[PDB]
């Protein structure tokens, strides 16, 4: 469904649309009044369409057949349609401006105008600020639309989110397909999983989210940090973080590569460990330096403490925890004795690593504020034994 | 092993250094109990030995220095630093003796400054308190979070002070020789820990005058000689060491400022004595001399009719020398002030060689030389050095900004002031840490002690300078915001947060204005506090606005709109807390609508008269959001007020519609009473917004329009019906047991009083027939009932008391007015 | 109570001492004038021992003033939600602002001399990065009014006075290479925050002063608070003076950049924002007129608020004039297609009626003169 | 239970009485041998009054048996010591305590 919405949705990716003229050649030409075209949603790959049954929606390309998905921009609502314009080779006349021209969207076949539904009463009581978008014969005067440019960063990020979501969902679907079906002394009996593509995507995204080097100058480093925080927020709002969590959850049920092979085969069992480490590293990259993304774990912190003991990605899980605790005080106020004891057992079982001490130090103080409960629990459980 | 093998065993070095970091973290920010516990694992002997151990790695050396500071010194230094900004000067012989310039042969104005940090200081700083470390002591029977807060562990401060001086001198001398084997492997690791310890001890006040002199000689002997060795400033030191040096210099500059403040206070003592005597003699001589002239006698007497502050201003207005003649004071008294002013300007350096000969020149030249020599890479160091440069160049402005924190007190208030200061230090410490039960108890107890203190009431300007109310508000809000949506914890602390702040506005108008300035913050924090019962930030706001026409007229329509939006949300949605408690689900929250309404009442009604500026705004906002009026008074599909009251009474009779009907608190909400009280508050607020008559006689269109709107909203027949509604009366029955109404769940005379006020202010009683109608329907029956209840058994009943209040407050005055 | 007012000799010494402290502060310490700004700036501009180094020249080490400007630019460029208040920054900005101007017919040569001295004192700053720091802090304020932005604007005005083309060029080059929208976003938000006359506030103030309760401390009748009416008049004038000085000298590059920023993803028309503020201002002035129309004589506070509004309007008019002078044809067309015509119609109505009304009483002559100058 | 063994003898006649301040140097170890307290590290003798209940039951009774100048080892069960709750951070729950005590003087 399509809505007129204001707020952070503006800065979000879901508000991003791509204009696709019906011609392949010279599709980058200047847009022209009455020029038929399709409107694509970047993060979903779906196309604005008019459907007899559900009216204005976004449909898949397979169902986009140029009668539902063909739209034009008109400067005025009058039904002139005096002459269909001839196709032009070259960029052509520069008619429509960014942020100045006022455009009315019209479905070519029906001639309907893009407009809002005039929210029914009690919507104000709900405090719902979003207005469903409809196609209507007359519409409203204010139906005109400014077109605003997006950053190359945002466009790239939206496309990458779309592809990453598709890939990881296919991976998850395969894992669910052979979740509870052992292969025995046979094949896993299912479509080949995209291990290589998943690995390369994970590596590319880690490099994409890599933090700037300290050697950099202050101004450029701050600009890179802005870019990184924005990209993290966009990925989070489009749900990549939850997708990574789901992938990790499904890969965790298998303790080891052999246990994975029993269901998937040795060929994927080899890459099991690499994939889990890459997923944890990507999670750390997404949440590092982002207070909101780190705060999301307040509801589910046990998701990390329960996994701390696992041997395959111990360092990655620990880094995830470190980032979360440095950024978010909410997690610190929800900490518990069970969590502290698990972290101390990590010292006991895995060895004397100063990173655990850094985590425990972060548990005590955040942003100049101390947590007495955490302080006292750490003291009581760690110090007196003296081992 | 020997701990010194960690010079080559590096993994162990890192692990142990981070262990020291953890030790500091667990005791960070006031956990004196954890400090005591640590004193067991890392003992005083270990720490002191580590201080002197030259062969340790720098990380371990610094970690042990900082661990000592954290365990023993951090809380005390922070508490003292909090006070250092303030200058509470007792009027004492010691203060009198204080002079900007020590005595000697040179004239004070032209004289060389005395040594910073050396001399007499009378400003009040509360003492440090320490508890010995002992682990064989009897375990208190008292429970956790109720036992008193523990003090920081004790360590021998004079011995530590001497050792710090000695190590600093040794470091200076060896850095003079440029050894290839510095302690810790670096000049940084050699110097920084000692300097941090020394700065902590200075701020704490451990160092004496001679020790300060030795430190000054280490810094720069040539400048601070009192009447070869190389100084740290000449030792060509790295940036972190420079940062510590800057902190030390900041301490000394602060001491110079404090000396200026104290000298000004002493001069004020001495000079006020003379001015008071002169005023007495002059009044006296005027009385002997009133005979000759009347008018010019009047003119001088204008001085004694002036308030004291204006008398001061008049006496001191002789600077320009053009107002000298009009200034009454004689030339000698004037010259005393002029001389002191010149001395002050000289001491601050306004009055105008290669060798500095003063702290200001030393600091300025050092900072400029550092910046010239190298491009500093440390923003913190840059900030500090340029702050010092600013202070040296503008000393008068520093004093000008510091004085607002200066207050002179009699020596007789010293002990109470010190107790109050300790309580305020506790409260200030509570800002940094998260709230808990123990912290809540400490907060409540400190507030109670402060409120018992007489100084709190006598010296409200002192408290406003101290920022007591602001710190209390910061604590309250830090509690409010955290997990606000889920639930509000530590409600007793917020209830205290009024009792303190919310008597505070009553103590003085200036306090009330100070809180009015923070009003919006209180209002935006009010939303959660509503569910909590007792004294609330909305009550703090009401105290800020109450009975002050200036503040009410300065009140903002933005704040009013915020209140009205909250009330609309209340009128549209029920209370989730009540729903969770299992109450019947209605569509709106009478309980919060009532609070917002009485806040608006206090805003619009002052000293018996309406404020039209706020009243009209309230009316307009309320009509624009009419859901605030209630599900009744809605218009379309809306039952009337009278029907609402009747249905509320039926609800009160019927459980499972008045409450959960499956209270320990006994404050259990009764929906019928809540609805009746909401509507009564609404009617009262509308009546209070109603115009005063004199405007109506003047024929002011705005007043007439407002009154017509109010009448349209509330018809008269409904008011009369509510006034006529019967009120249950205590009866004696069934063995002589009293059957008696419950106020919290029943219709009460205050509901009627609101309607009476509305009727009087809006509709008015101008016709005998209507007057008699009201008497025969509603008023007279209630008077008969009250008089019937005027019996020994029934006289003290809450219903009888409520009836008497209702009558005297609303009815009887109305009958008196309508008597003709 | 006036008779009962206790004489000074009857008070306890400590209360009297605090009163003395406040009075002495106000009369002596505050009134005292000491100038250290120029001396500070010179001492920080001078660089030492580079003559003996003889390679540090080729190295180009920043001098202390350059380092301070770099520090504050660092603080500005740091990524965070809000611009924290910095008394050090504001104090040093005030010092630099004083350093520039450092100040009945005068000679042409003297007048050129003053220009040259001012240009030198401006160079001391913009060679070291003051213009870029100004822009960075304006972007950092994120459209929130405050003392930080006030000091930054005053510094910008100080360095830009006389239409300093060098500072102009530097500002523009910085803006165009960085291609950041936050600067103009903050400018727009500050314009929106800028206040106009409020008759409700005026009436409330009048009623407050009429009530005139004595303050509980001593006796203070008609105790004055911050002027509820146009409290931010100085800020509005400084903002528009800064925008005017950008275009001073008929700098077509600014005159067009203010209208449109080609490189940036989005652009803001400061010309139209100025027109909108002017329209709001003339609406306020016409309403305040209608308030005073019936009354024969305007009172003192009304005169004052009229003077404030007319000063703001004069500065706005000069800014709009400077936007187009040279001429800048695009800005001319934008204004011609703007609502400046409606603003002018309203101003003409007010001008005529106030002219007639104020001619009647001589007590209103100064306000009439100000009105005529504004026309 | 308090269990006292003489490391070094005292005078053998002068024994603490109620209301009499005892001055001691002590070193505290857990039964495993870990040290948690020592007055000598602080370099300050520890003074306590008998019958007052400043110190734990074990110290009361054990020092009651000692003599001036006597050095002794005191073994105290948890029930005479801090017991189940323990001393947080310092002493674990259910910890037997070993102390080396020198009774310097009575005052």
Residue numbers in the entry:
A (entry chain D): 244 to 630
B (entry chain D): 1648 to 1874, 1922 to 2046, 2088 to 2397, 2410 to 2567
C (entry chain D): 3634 to 3736, 3749 to 4020
D (entry chain H): 1 to 107
From the paper:
pmcRyanodine receptors (RyRs) are intracellular calcium channels involved in the excitation–contraction coupling in muscle cells and in calcium signaling in neurons and other cell types. Here, using cryo-EM, we explore multiple xanthine derivatives and related compounds and identify 4-oxopyrimidine/2-pyridone as the minimal motif necessary for binding to the xanthine/caffeine binding site in RyRs.
To determine the minimal motif necessary for binding to the xanthine/caffeine binding site and how different substitutions affect the coordination mode, we resolved the cryo-EM structure of RyR1 in the presence of different xanthine derivates. We were able to model the most likely position of the xanthine derivates thanks to the clear additional densities from the substituent groups and found the xanthine scaffold in a similar orientation in all four samples, stacked on RyR1–Trp4716.
